[PDB]
């Protein structure tokens, strides 16, 4: 419901001197907004839900390949005719042999033959369509407002805070205004408009692994298919059946089935996660205007802790340019501000590193409290530092 | 000489393709007032002030005062994706489509 | 999967309110409608409105606008229904009930509902 | 009084077929789609059908349901004891503005 942590996370500074920003959120995507003199904040889309789909087709891979038969007819006595051709208990399909007195015939030559081969399926490689009011997003906001390690990823704690929320989007109300307290509040006005892909595209189902494949590849491919009814046609693909045999047997091998038919047009499509009736779009996208002018600072005006700060360990990379790291307040007094900053060398006068986490500071007044910290600092080596003096404590770092 | 519809406006299904580069859909109104014109129009992007798809059924409007009237409407959108929308401000809605 | 769990039942005066609660789980909260449904002891299915757990917009039963009121909280995924004035009349069985996935108010129906909450109203 | 008129009753013996019909107006089943409801007895109601005649996971064939005109029907085959229940149709109502139920019809099972 928050940034930290996640690989697909945007860092924004909206413009210069706005109180809004445009913004773009997607599927398993997060991003964090940093605003002057305002607290940062995550927008971060949480789910895509349809508040009923419907099957169109249902290629199979097969077993019933079982059962036989071989209608004989002599040459000159015409065709033959499988009594198993009445229902299509079987599938049947029709040869001629070289036989005569050999093999019980009265005269030589060429004698009819219809044979028959039973058919039901086994794996349906289901697939179903997407009609384009239902459609109801879930954004989650956060607040970069104090935190540590620890409540950094509780929804629960935070909302508590009110230093979270997580409200829906609908074509119907676009927009929304989320209270965060002291903090005043955000309002976005995310626009349900999406890319996005028409439904032009189906819905493949295999086993486990959903897909998205185009109609047509889909519909124009080789394999026996069922709408929506227990019956079957093109099962053809119950081939070589064709021995060309004896009126006794007509060997009716299951043909091999082999998933490389499918698993090779992988790539081609998209793959998306499908709960039995629904289907998360990522794929999907959603534009938003983060209004914030009603976004607003809190606790600046208390005055800077002034007491010892240690470090709880060596501050990680978050992949993004920006490390964290969570302090220590020795500090007996109440909420102060953190007077941590980015050096570019020890006792520099004008810091050089922005903090994610702007205008940090000790929440409470119960002494040794924790303080989580995200700051981007400059390339190359440098300083964090906490405190001032000789309670000034430091950290070297280097940038790449 | 009525004036403009000012009350909430729902689709009643997915606008459907004329196969003739335009669609179809039937809205029903919310409103109690009576005889007011619809306020739909085909937007580029949500909230753009000009409109960009001409209506086939063209000045629209609630025929009766008796609330919850249908309204069929056909109209042709540009190409590509686009926004149906209907009402203004909080009470607008919307529904986009993609035409090819 | 989707999981609603109500209050216990409930015993009142003519005259007095009651407050029945709609606990939600197992899908995204503000992304369904609620309905609710009253059912009196050996009779039918009424419905009494909705809400929109999404920005809190509601619309009620036309006969029993006026003495209902149904709110929700979104950080506890709980959705409100309070009748007041009560009646002998109002002895039921009240059930909330998600909505099947509209994305309309119109066109919605309950589709899971919960246990129901007995309300008796007697002196 | 309910806004669409069912039957208060109806009973068949094992592995019969029985229908119960829903009968409304053009406001109503004449318009819109028609949902049925099945309620066992102590327990809440569960969606059976929708849109006149589509059914949910779980719910069998033997289900169905049909609409015509300002009237629908719910029938049952191969009748079981354990579909004893009351039954009720739905629909939303355009001059109501809302959703609007059957009475309800007590399905009983015979010996």
């Known amino acids: 419901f928050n940034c930290l942590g996640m690989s697909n996370r945007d860092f924004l500074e909206g413009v210069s001197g706005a109180t809004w920003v445009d913004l773009v959120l997607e599927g398993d995507s997060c991003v964090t907004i940093m605003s002057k003199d305002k607290p940062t904040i995550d927008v971060k889309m949480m789910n895509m839900e349809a508040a009923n789909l419907a099957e169109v087709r249902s290629y199979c891979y097969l077993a019933t390949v079982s059962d036989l038969s071989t209608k004989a007819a002599c040459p000159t006595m015409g065709e033959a005719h499988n009594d198993k051709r009445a229902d299509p208990a079987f599938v049947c399909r029709q040869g001629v042999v070289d036989r005569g007195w050999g093999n019980g015939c009265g005269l030589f030559g060429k004698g009819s033959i219809d044979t028959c081969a039973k058919f039901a399926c086994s794996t349906k490689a289901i697939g179903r369509t997407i009609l384009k009011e239902n459609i109801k997003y879930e954004v989650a906001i956060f607040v970069h407002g104090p935190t540590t390690v620890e409540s950094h990823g509780n929804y629960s704690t935070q909302v508590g805070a009110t230093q979270a929320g997580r409200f829906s989007i609908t074509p119907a109300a676009p927009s929304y205004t989320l209270k965060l307290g002291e903090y005043g509040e955000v309002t976005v006005d995310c626009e349900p408009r999406s890319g996005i892909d028409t439904n032009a595209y189906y819905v493949m189902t295999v086993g486990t692994k959903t897909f998205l494949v185009h109609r047509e590849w889909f519909m124009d491919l080789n394999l026996p298919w069922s709408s929506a009814g227990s019956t079957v046609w093109r099962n053809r693909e119950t081939l070589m059946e064709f021995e060309e045999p004896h009126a006794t047997k007509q060997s009716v091998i299951a043909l091999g089935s082999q998933e490389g038919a499918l698993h090779q047009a992988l790539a081609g499509a998209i793959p998306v996660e499908f709960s039995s009736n629904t289907v998360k779009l990522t794929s999907g996208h959603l534009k938003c205007r983060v209004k914030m002018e009603k976004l607003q600072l809190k606790g600046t005006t208390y005055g800077v802790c002034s007491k010892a700060f240690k470090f709880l360990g060596t501050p990680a990379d978050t992949g993004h340019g920006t490390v964290v790291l969570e302090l220590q307040y020795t500090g007996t007094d109440g909420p102060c501000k953190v007077p941590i900053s980015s050096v570019a060398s020890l006792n520099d006068l004008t810091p050089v590193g922005r903090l994610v986490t702007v205008n940090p500071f000790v929440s409470v007044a119960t002494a040794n409290a924790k303080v989580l910290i995200e700051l981007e600092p400059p390339f190359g080596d440098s300083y964090i530092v906490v405190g001032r003096g000789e309670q000034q404590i430091n950290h070297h770092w280097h940038k790449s | 000489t009525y004036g403009v519809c000012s009350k909430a406006f729902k689709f009643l299904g997915t606008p459907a393709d004329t196969g003739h580069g335009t669609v179809v859909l039937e809205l029903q109104y919310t409103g109690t007032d009576g005889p007011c014109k619809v306020p739909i129009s085909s937007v580029a992007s949500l909230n753009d002030l000009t409109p960009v798809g001409r209506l086939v059924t063209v000045n629209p409007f609630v025929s009766v005062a008796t609330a919850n009237a249908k309204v069929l409407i056909e109209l042709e959108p540009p190409f590509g994706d686009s926004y149906i929308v209907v009402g203004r401000g909080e009470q607008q809605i919307n529904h986009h489509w993609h035409k090819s | 999967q989707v999981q609603l769990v109500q209050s216990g039942a409930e015993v009142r005066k003519p005259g007095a309110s009651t407050k029945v609660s709609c606990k939600a789980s197992?899908?995204?909260?503000?992304?369904?409608?609620m309905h609710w449904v009253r059912q009196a002891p050996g009779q039918g299915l009424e419905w009494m409105g909705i809400?929109?757990?999404?920005?809190?917009?509601?619309t009620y039963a036309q006969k029993l606008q006026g003495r209902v009121t149904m709110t929700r909280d979104t950080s506890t995924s709980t959705v409100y229904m309070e009748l007041s004035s009560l009646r002998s009349e109002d002895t039921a069985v009240y059930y909330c009930?998600?909505?099947?996935?509209?994305?309309?108010?119109?066109?919605?129906?309950?589709?899971?509902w919960g246990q129901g909450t007995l309300v008796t109203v007697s002196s | 009084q309910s806004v669409l008129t069912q039957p208060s009753s109806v009973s068949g013996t094992p592995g019969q077929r029985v229908t119960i019909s829903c009968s409304g107006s053009?406001?109503?089943?004449?318009?819109?789609?028609v949902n049925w409801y099945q309620q066992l007895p102590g327990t809440a109601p569960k969606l059976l059908i929708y849109?006149?005649?589509q059914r949910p996971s779980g719910v069998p064939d033997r289900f169905s349901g049909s609409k015509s005109g300002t009237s629908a029907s719910l029938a049952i085959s191969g009748l079981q004891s354990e579909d004893e229940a009351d039954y009720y149709c739905?629909?939303?109502?355009?001059?109501?503005?809302?959703?609007?139920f059957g009475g309800g019809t007590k399905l009983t099972v015979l010996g």
């Open positions: 009930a998600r909505d099947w996935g509209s994305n309309y108010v119109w066109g919605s129906y309950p589709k899971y």
């Open positions: 197992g899908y995204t909260f503000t992304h369904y409608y």
């Open positions: 809400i929109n757990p999404s920005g809190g917009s509601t």
């Open positions: 053009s406001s109503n089943i004449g318009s819109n789609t």
């Open positions: 849109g006149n005649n």
């Open positions: 739905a629909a939303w109502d355009d001059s109501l503005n809302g959703p609007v």
